[PDB]
Amino acid sequence: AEATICYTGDILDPSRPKYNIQYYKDLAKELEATGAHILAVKDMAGLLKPQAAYRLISELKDTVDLPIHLHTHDTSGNGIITYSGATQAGVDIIDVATASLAGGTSQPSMQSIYYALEHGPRHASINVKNAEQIDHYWEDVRKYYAPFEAGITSPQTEVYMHEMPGGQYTNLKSQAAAVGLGHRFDEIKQM
Amino acid sequence: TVNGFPGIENTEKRHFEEPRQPLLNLEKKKTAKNILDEQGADAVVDYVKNTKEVLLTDTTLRDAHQSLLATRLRLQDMKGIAQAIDQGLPELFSAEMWGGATFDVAYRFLNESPWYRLRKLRKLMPNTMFQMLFRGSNAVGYQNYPDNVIEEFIRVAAHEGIDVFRIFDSLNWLPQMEKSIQAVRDNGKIAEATICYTGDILDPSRPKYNIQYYKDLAKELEATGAHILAVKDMAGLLKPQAAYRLISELKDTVDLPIHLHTHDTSGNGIITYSGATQAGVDIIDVATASLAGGTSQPSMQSIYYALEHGPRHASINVKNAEQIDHYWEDVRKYYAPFEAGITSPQTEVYMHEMPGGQYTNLKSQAAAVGLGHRFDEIKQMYRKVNMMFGDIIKVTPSSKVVGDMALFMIQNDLTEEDVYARGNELNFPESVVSFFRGDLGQPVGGFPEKLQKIIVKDKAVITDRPGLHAEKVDFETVKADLEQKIGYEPGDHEVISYIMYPQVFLDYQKMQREFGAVTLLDTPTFLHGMRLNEKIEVQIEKGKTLSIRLDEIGEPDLAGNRVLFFNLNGQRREVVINDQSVQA
Amino acid sequence: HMKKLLVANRGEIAVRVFRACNELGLSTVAVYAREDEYSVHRFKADESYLIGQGKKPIDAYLDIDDIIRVALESGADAIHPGYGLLSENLE
Ligand SMILES: [Mg+2]
Ligand SMILES: [Mn+2]
Ligand SMILES: [Mn+2]
């Protein structure tokens, strides 16, 4: 059983004190009160900044004894560095995707996270040559799904403002495109 | 309209919204351009040294669209946002807006002068340092030029507004950079001596480019009067631990500020920049978010939020950067025919070390001929060719050498032992024989001398600076010849660009005489022409705006010509154009 | 001292003043409403500028502040009002 804390807001921002580090600490204690085997941190919208990642993982590791499983998205382009900062703080498991299906709203690449931690104090437990061999199949079969692909994908730090998850972003874009409001999707995000 | 833009599909022109204009919170502050203006380059160096934040160099205007949009980004799109970048982002150390492939690409494919782009951007961006990528002895060409040509290019570029010269050699050979560094110093500008990073300093199995090699090259570059040491990672090979180690060792070695430039090809650009920021790097090259990632630079907004609560912050106004990125996102849609496609992090760049421009050009050259279905074998050939040449530094133009050698070797089905034993009979590609003849300079550790004897046959091999063996150029003779070729007396910039790219400049002049200043058109109109009943407005100068409307496209006659029924400035004008499809 | 003149009018009188200014060696600045974009007088001058954006075209040609703003930013030394719009206007 992986009890999961959905991360939101910013622990290092004093102007948003509702989701602060103490809230996550007491929630982690409550989850460890249940017999859950692994504590999970769900960053569904890629909101976890690297310094915030280090602080949160350190404060959870000195609070509970459960192993920590971090899951984040790379929509702001900061997924790899957030994972590395959590690796410094002592995170146990991190959620990665293959390189051909990584980046953007998806998870950070597992090959990229191997080479990010290659000569640091903590390595990534993976066979990176095997993963790079799997990634060829994954891009070849990604070419099959061209009608379901999104457009040009670039890192977007505006997710730190509207905090939309990637699926919510795509569904709100589809709703704004089906009805005649897509020319004010920026107003939709501000809304 | 009738024949399509060359090199792209002849699709219809999509309707485009106007690009979103930023809402900026302007804060006046003294920029590095101002310090270079009143005080000297050394005061700029002191300003960089005394800044605790990491400084940012925007590569949006040069390298971001060189990597992603095949350098096709036009001045007309830069002009709508240049003032917004200059005012809304005054914390930028410099803006990389010139050099590299921009000089060739503007003249050849965009039919606009790089000098005209530099002048217009300099007028629009008074408080922003302008940075160009200078190839040392090659300057903005691919061959070598005599010393006075390089000095005249530096003088004209510094006079027209280039503030920072990033000077690199494709094989990290200091003799091919000393004179350019001196000329930049003499012209009152900042000289950035550049180390091209290759290999892996933390991999003991590859000792040719280890930490000591970079330290020795660094003190050699500090022996010249270069103001800033630049670390160029053209393929994104610099891993984060390697970045921390390399920047720490360089900061122990030299007193120059360090300027790190990397690509995000492996998806590790942000973390590499963060590791260099921990090691004490001074300036890092970033792109706007809409033109970042993949083969381009790491995002400026992303690197702000990566270092937001660390010991060192990024010196940028991130809200203004996001507002500018809205415009960049909108104008990227104009360049859909030049997009690479679906992109993803690829750590295979650690294996073949192909820079992104070399990757795209090798993909184009491999798919244009019919053998592109084994591009994985092509990349493996590239890696083994690089190992065969003696593990050379692969950047423009020596990356072209390795690429052409690998392309020849799988195009005609060669092998390492094939070249090493019976290679004396094949006609080798001319870039490889020019590299092995010493036209690109001297590699680290020397050539593979007996293999060099296989490549070169009965051609002269030189072992010194190729600029010493260069035919002299007289500027009055060239200027008089150019005044004969073009219909007027050229400027110094025209003379110097005619020296480097003679046929390209003359073709640009012919296209100027035929089509005029096509740089003033908007990019959808530039690439797709006009649709029926469309109204466009072309501001040809201040106070003059051509109102152009396409009313009817005539059927092609027996001679293959079409009559296009325009409404120019209210009046009907019938334009006859030859349709190339019908062919008379 | 005069080198550039603006005409705060349209139609044939603007062209008449433009021809007189060209004979006298002065530069010419035209103004035009959006609905007058195909007028000949717009294209008979050295510089032309849109005035009264969003207004009715007659009210656009009576936009006093916009006309002086255009004349100032264009560097026009003088304004010829022609007739019928602001020639007799004291303000
Ligand atoms: Mg500093
Ligand atoms: Mn998820
Ligand atoms: Mn680059």
mmCIF file of C-alpha atoms in Angstrom, chain A residues 7 41-50 53 69-76 78-84 86 93-97 103-109 160:
data_model
loop_
_atom_site.group_PDB
_atom_site.id
_atom_site.type_symbol
_atom_site.label_atom_id
_atom_site.label_comp_id
_atom_site.label_asym_id
_atom_site.label_seq_id
_atom_site.Cartn_x
_atom_site.Cartn_y
_atom_site.Cartn_z
ATOM 1 C CA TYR A 7 1.653 18.076 -3.408
ATOM 2 C CA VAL A 41 4.538 12.203 -2.840
ATOM 3 C CA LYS A 42 2.370 12.980 -5.861
ATOM 4 C CA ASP A 43 3.384 16.083 -7.757
ATOM 5 C CA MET A 44 0.615 15.798 -10.328
ATOM 6 C CA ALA A 45 1.231 19.205 -11.941
ATOM 7 C CA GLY A 46 5.020 19.401 -11.678
ATOM 8 C CA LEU A 47 4.813 22.042 -8.935
ATOM 9 C CA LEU A 48 7.699 20.738 -6.803
ATOM 10 C CA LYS A 49 10.681 23.056 -7.198
ATOM 11 C CA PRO A 50 14.140 21.508 -6.567
ATOM 12 C CA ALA A 53 11.929 19.040 -3.188
ATOM 13 C CA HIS A 69 8.310 7.499 -3.421
ATOM 14 C CA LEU A 70 8.397 10.746 -5.412
ATOM 15 C CA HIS A 71 6.284 11.210 -8.545
ATOM 16 C CA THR A 72 6.522 14.439 -10.538
ATOM 17 C CA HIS A 73 5.884 15.771 -14.025
ATOM 18 C CA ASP A 74 8.364 17.680 -16.178
ATOM 19 C CA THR A 75 5.979 20.322 -17.543
ATOM 20 C CA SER A 76 8.060 23.229 -16.225
ATOM 21 C CA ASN A 78 12.521 21.135 -13.871
ATOM 22 C CA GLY A 79 11.692 17.453 -13.341
ATOM 23 C CA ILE A 80 15.239 16.084 -13.572
ATOM 24 C CA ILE A 81 16.686 18.661 -11.180
ATOM 25 C CA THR A 82 13.760 18.165 -8.770
ATOM 26 C CA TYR A 83 14.479 14.424 -8.787
ATOM 27 C CA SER A 84 18.188 15.080 -8.227
ATOM 28 C CA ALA A 86 15.157 14.789 -3.776
ATOM 29 C CA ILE A 93 11.988 5.684 -5.460
ATOM 30 C CA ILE A 94 11.295 8.160 -8.270
ATOM 31 C CA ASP A 95 8.822 7.856 -11.142
ATOM 32 C CA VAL A 96 10.468 8.025 -14.567
ATOM 33 C CA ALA A 97 9.380 7.407 -18.143
ATOM 34 C CA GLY A 103 9.399 15.416 -21.082
ATOM 35 C CA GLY A 104 6.610 17.936 -21.260
ATOM 36 C CA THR A 105 3.569 16.877 -19.272
ATOM 37 C CA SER A 106 5.056 13.377 -18.816
ATOM 38 C CA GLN A 107 7.679 12.156 -16.327
ATOM 39 C CA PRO A 108 11.423 12.864 -16.547
ATOM 40 C CA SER A 109 13.441 10.459 -18.679
ATOM 41 C CA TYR A 160 3.492 27.318 -11.305
#
